[PDB]
Amino acid sequence: LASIFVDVSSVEPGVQLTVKFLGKPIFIRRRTEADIELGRSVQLGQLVDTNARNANIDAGAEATDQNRTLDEAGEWLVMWGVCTHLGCVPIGGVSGDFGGWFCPCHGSHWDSAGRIRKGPAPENLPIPLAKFIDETTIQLG
Numbered sequence: 001l002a003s004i005f006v007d008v009s010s011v012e013p014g015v016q017l018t019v020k021f022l023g024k025p026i027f028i029r030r031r032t033e034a035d036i037e038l039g040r041s042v043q044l045g046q047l048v049d050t051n052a053r054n055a056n057i058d059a060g061a062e063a064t065d066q067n068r069t070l071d072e073a074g075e076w077l078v079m080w081g082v083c084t085h086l087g088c089v090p091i092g093g094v095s096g097d098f099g100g101w102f103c104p105c106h107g108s109h110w111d112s113a114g115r116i117r118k119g120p121a122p123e124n125l126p127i128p129l130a131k132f133i134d135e136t137t138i139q140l141g
């Protein structure tokens, strides 16, 4: 079966683990307290794309910070690292103008929940099928 199993037991706050799945990068960021708070400080009315783009929940879900992470605590942000414009790999480590990711191909910026805030990309970075199967492992797929 296609599913893969990623050990995230050593991922510290502020670290992104990047793992290849279906030929493309998946970003698994363990968010910092600053990342979480700022994601939660954005109002839906401020967002370019209000859809959660999240394979794990209803396809009409709103892009609240809570609908962008695997966990209620908001520490685990798992997304396809594939720009929604033309597919370049977004640069992270708190890059761009919104404390998230920046795509240098044409200047798109995503926030700390991976939501699109500026540039030509039309959508929030999509979230793959992903869930914890115990304390240390995320199943992708």
Ligand code: FES
Pocket: 083, 084, 085, 086, 087, 088, 103, 104, 105, 106, 107, 108, 119, 120, 121
């Ligand atoms: S491919 Fe990312 S902004 Fe164009």
